[PDB]
Design a protein around this nucleic acid. Sequence first.
RNA 1: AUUCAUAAUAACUUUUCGAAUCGCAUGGCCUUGUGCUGGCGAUGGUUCAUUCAAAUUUCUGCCCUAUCAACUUUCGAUGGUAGGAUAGUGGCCUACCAUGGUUUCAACGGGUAACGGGGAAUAAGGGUUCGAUUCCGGAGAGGGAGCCUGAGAAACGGCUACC
RNA 2: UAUCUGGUUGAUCCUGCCAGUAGUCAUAUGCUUGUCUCAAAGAUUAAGCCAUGCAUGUCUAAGUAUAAGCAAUUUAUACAGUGAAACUGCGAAUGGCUCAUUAAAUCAGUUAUCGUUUAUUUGAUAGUUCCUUUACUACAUGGUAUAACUGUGGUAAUUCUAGA
Lengths: 185, 260, 167, 134
Amino acid sequence: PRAPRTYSKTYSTPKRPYESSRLDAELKLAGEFGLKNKKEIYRISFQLSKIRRAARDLLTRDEKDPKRLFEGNALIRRLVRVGVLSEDKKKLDYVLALKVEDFLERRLQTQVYKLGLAKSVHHARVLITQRHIAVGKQIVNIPSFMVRLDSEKHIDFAPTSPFGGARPGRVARRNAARKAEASGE
Amino acid sequence: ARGPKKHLKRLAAPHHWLLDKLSGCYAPRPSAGPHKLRESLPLIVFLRNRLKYALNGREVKAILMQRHVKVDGKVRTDTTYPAGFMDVITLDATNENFRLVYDVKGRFAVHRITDEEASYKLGKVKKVQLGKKGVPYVVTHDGRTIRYPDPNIKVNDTVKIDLASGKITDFIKFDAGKLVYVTGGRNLGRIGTIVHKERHDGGFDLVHIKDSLDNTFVTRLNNVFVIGEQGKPYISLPKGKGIKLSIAEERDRRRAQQGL
Amino acid sequence: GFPMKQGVLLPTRIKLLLTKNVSCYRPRRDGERKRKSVRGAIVGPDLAVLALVIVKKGEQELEGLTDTTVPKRLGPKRANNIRKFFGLSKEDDVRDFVIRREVTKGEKTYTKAPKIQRLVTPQRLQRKRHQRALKVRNAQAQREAAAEYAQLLAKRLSERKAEKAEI
Amino acid sequence: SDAVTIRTRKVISNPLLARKQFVVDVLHPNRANVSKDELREKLAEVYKAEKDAVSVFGFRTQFGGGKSVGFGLVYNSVAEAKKFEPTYRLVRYGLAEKVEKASRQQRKQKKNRDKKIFGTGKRLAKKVARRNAD
RNA sequence: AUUCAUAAUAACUUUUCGAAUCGCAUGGCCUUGUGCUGGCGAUGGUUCAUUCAAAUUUCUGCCCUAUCAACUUUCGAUGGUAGGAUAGUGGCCUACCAUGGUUUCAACGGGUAACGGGGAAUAAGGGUUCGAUUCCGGAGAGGGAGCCUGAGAAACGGCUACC
RNA sequence: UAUCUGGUUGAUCCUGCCAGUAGUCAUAUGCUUGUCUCAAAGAUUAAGCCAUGCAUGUCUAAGUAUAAGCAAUUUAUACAGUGAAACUGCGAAUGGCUCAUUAAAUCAGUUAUCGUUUAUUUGAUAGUUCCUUUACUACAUGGUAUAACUGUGGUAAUUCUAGA
Ligand SMILES: [Mg+2]
Ligand SMILES: [Mg+2]
Ligand SMILES: [Mg+2]
Ligand SMILES: [Mg+2]
Ligand SMILES: [Mg+2]
Ligand SMILES: [Mg+2]
Ligand SMILES: [Mg+2]
Ligand SMILES: [Mg+2]
Ligand SMILES: [Mg+2]
Ligand SMILES: [Mg+2]
Ligand SMILES: [Mg+2]
Ligand SMILES: [Mg+2]
Ligand SMILES: [Mg+2]
Ligand SMILES: [Mg+2]
Ligand SMILES: [Mg+2]
Ligand SMILES: [Mg+2]
Ligand SMILES: [Mg+2]
Ligand SMILES: [Mg+2]
Ligand SMILES: [Mg+2]
Ligand SMILES: [Mg+2]
């Protein structure tokens, strides 16, 4: 008898299982952003639906309302901070007009590919999950790190990654050891 | 059933203790004392969660066995002693005093006071009666019985206890245009002056209190604690002065505090 | 193994609701009563051991009853019980005549004596006169508090009756 | 000379417990969670008190390594350090040994067996011997 | 708001309480007796407050069913008086008295794969279904019943009896 | 997250259900199961029955120490330290479990005690102790009666108990 640990679902399965248009756009976005499942689209669609209905229920209230100003501007600032909503178009109407790609372009897997450094979205995913990117002074192995526009200049190689230094790598050490074993000292 | 209860679980503790949901299944149940269970801060909560002088409850017991903590001039080595509103906590080590005043958010605030402030306290006169052998006495909000008071004192007034003797120094009367402190309700921790009060025959009278920022509100008189005249508080007020500005202006002071 | 009970005028066993401070039973909780079978007080062939106590010594000598005496285990621990034991007086000294027991540890000899209860010590007289002074000073403090409040009531009555007369 | 970079955030003086509390965060490159005993002797000359009066606990190093964050205490003297230190951390600092008691189930069994005997039990110890002998 | 707090008078009591208790320090004083006086507490203790409460209690709100429309009142049902019992109000019980009380606005009865609520699932809105179960309140310790001690139990890791 | 589709006919438009479809802190079961965090878990049928072990005991300078216990005492031949056992005080009426009863009953929100009890905590509180004193009973301080303890036993047995 403790306090219950809070948890919730972060995605929603679409109502129609087999629509050829929806399967087209899901697998288009899965290959475009190098995603693993359709769950990585459903989770982003869950965040669209939550913030869309939050802006919908707050646009229902009229202007100058303290609840509308507080919750609207906090969601506006959160979306501007993450970089989904741009510097302009800071309105809840544009929040209603947000799309799936506005969160897919802000992921660490997308961003590591986009500032060079990866040469592919799938190479960006495997560099992140093999601990080659430190965003600040902390390494990240989550492809959905969701960079928040204050870390873009600091998306670099990790200080403890063989690309970033401090180590020659495990398979390079074994290959160098075999060359030394076949050559001499 | 079958008798009094001795365990207080978490999620049943008072919310102003700000206790963690996790890290335990229970909360410190306050023992019997001068104040009610739901409206008092235990000494373990004041030391381990507010002062942060202790990491566990075992060392809270260790200071109280060392008798460093005392409230109202008395040691009170009990761990869950119910120190409440208008109670002074004196640590002779570090030469540090507090008064358990509320803040603007309705929680018990760490408000450090000087020694000439810790030399007295305010008490709201709960009831006035003639005791045995015809001796008048008053009972304050902390259960103190003070015999032979000045007969100008009525109920819902405030006295100033010497706190070194079971006597009074001076009293302040429940009238219009006096600083009052809200002790209960959702208006807890609001400071203002009495606009007027209503008679309400049958019970539960009401007091209209407006702030210095003209934020008028109403409160039951059970929650109203007179703490001085017009201005001039008998106690050093905590940071905030009980103004209760809206949350949009609150997030503005955070930007102003962050703006250096 | 059933003890015979005092006052059971029956030749058999019987179950009784035994309580505190009765025979054949020692309670373990407060107010606990338990039903136990006890042998009757009437002596019959069903007994195993009967307890006899001698109240009058006779002409002959037994092997192990009247020959051997057992030394007394504990002497009087209270001061008045010592005074009535040795018959000194109402007011004499007990510390001289405290019974002292010798303990030998093989190599070391040491002596032990009881804590003498209910003796008169100047600590006890200090505590006694402390409550005497406590009641005396409380009586003067409450009387002067009532006198100050009475003169405060007289001042308030004189002030209010002066204002009521000239208003 | 690994630039271990010892520092203490949120230092609070606690003369109530006659000690000082702080948060020990270290930055150890190319090295893991170095150990507690060189952190104790390092904090000894940090606060100029003594090696034995320094108590530390915590130090969960951050993910990706290089940085360890933990809690630390410096006591005014070792005598009051022992008075206000938990006994599990005495044996962590070598100042005491584990008091060799029985297992918890065995202690409960001993108490429940000792509940049956009213008194010392010396007369029943000789009584069972006399009952078995004769 | 009181026949309130409190006081006074006359009394009454298988006469309540009003320290024959413990630790540490032991200062000061002169009728120099181990004399007078004194400190810091602990445990107690009558009563009034306080707190933890408990007990009862005011209004309003509960699922399905009429193939359940009349129910309650012998063995209290509704009220009055008086008493008893209770910690205390009260048909709570007793004695006397009156014939009342509930009901189609669903009484009473039956069923519940009924502990109540805070809550949960689903859901555009309105709703539907669930809630034994991390919190609050209740009830029980195989079924009943009775009781001792205790401030508080009709206690079951207390007792007694029957099944 | 304000959505429908297949099936009556030779064909049509309907009513209408069947069937699909998507969730369930909603259970069971099949197949499969590499990593980290988090954690429901004998409720449903049987509040059916239970082997065994544990879950309630508690001592500070401050009630009682002649353990024929230990260190031995720390003017210390009354004791003084620690201290098993046992008298004494307090707790054991908290908790934990379960939901079988229970349908204005519990319960919920809201009222009352001017209709009551309340250990403990906290504040205050007691010069009168004079039986019918013109008859007080030791206050530098009344009494016994017991545990633990010693010794004699009973019964196969129990946290059973007797006599001294
Ligand atoms: Mg590595
Ligand atoms: Mg009567
Ligand atoms: Mg009556
Ligand atoms: Mg009758
Ligand atoms: Mg149900
Ligand atoms: Mg049921
Ligand atoms: Mg439930
Ligand atoms: Mg019960
Ligand atoms: Mg009790
Ligand atoms: Mg029972
Ligand atoms: Mg049991
Ligand atoms: Mg129980
Ligand atoms: Mg259908
Ligand atoms: Mg791993
Ligand atoms: Mg069931
Ligand atoms: Mg069962
Ligand atoms: Mg319980
Ligand atoms: Mg458990
Ligand atoms: Mg269970
Ligand atoms: Mg008690």
